[PDB]
């Protein structure tokens with residue numbers, strides 16, 4: 001398990017949590033020195049539990065699929081909540097079984113469905129450590145519309161930050177003040193599968209992408225990533241989704 005406490009949180013303690021989260025994901029291989037997530041894991045070992053504590057010390061436990069860093073559901077007090085999708089239903093066979101009741105959320109976990117449920121695109125949802133504190137608090141008491149927004153915050157501040165160093169740094173910059181994600185942040189989130197695939201395809205291609213990946217950069221400029229010498233590959237991305245899952 002991995003843990004993060006919002007009480008006394010700062011950029012350093014958050015960095016330690018994101019390092020812990022990355023290190024809790026198993027891998028047997030690196031591709032261009034980036035951990036390659038496993039094709040599959042059988043049984044309960046598939047799921048990582050994140051213990052998150054809001055500023056007042058209340059806690060939820062979030063179940064993460066270690067193959068893809070996809071949040072499956074969470075436990076709040078004696079109630080478990082899972083996404084309305086088969087992967088989460090499968091996950092509910094292994095985690096939070098001791099919950100007094102289980103609620104299936106009225107949406108799947110993808111950004112599109114969450115944004116529809118939340119009533120807004122995550123372009124307009126501030127993120128940061130205060131937003132994460134709020135998200136935890138919201139998820140403690142069921143409200144599906146509110147939860148969708150909280151989950152968009154949670155996903156970005158945990159999984160996406162684990163996947164990209166740029167995004168952990170964005171959140172560290174928002175340690176004491178929320179701000180909507182940069183376009184670059186959104187671009188990276190949307191490109192994780194594509195980047196993961198092309199970095200793997202580059203292995204037998206002399207480091208060259210079979211298909212370029214278009215990203216937005218920190219200045220708001222749209223750029224093509226064509227090979228593994230790009231800073232996105234050498235510095236930013238920290239985890240690869242296995243092509244077997246793409």
Ligand SMILES: O=c1ccn([C@@H]2O[C@H](COP(=O)(O)OP(=O)(O)OP(=O)(O)O)[C@@H](O)[C@H]2O)c(=O)[nH]1
Pocket residue numbers: 069070071072083085087088108109110111112155159160
């Ligand atoms: O479009 C998105 C948006 C978000 N996510 C990811 O969702 C994770 C938690 O949500 P899930 O992983 O459970 O939803 P899913 O994406 O498997 O849903 P389908 O599209 O497969 O129906 C988060 O870690 C985030 O990266 C997506 O996989 N796709």
Ligand SMILES: *[C@@H]1O[C@H](CO)[C@@H](O)[C@H](O)[C@H]1NC(C)=O
Pocket residue numbers: 208226227228229230231
């Ligand atoms: C590879 O990407 C680098 C960094 O963006 C770029 O300068 C160069 O033109 C590309 N080289 C090849 C061989 O594609």
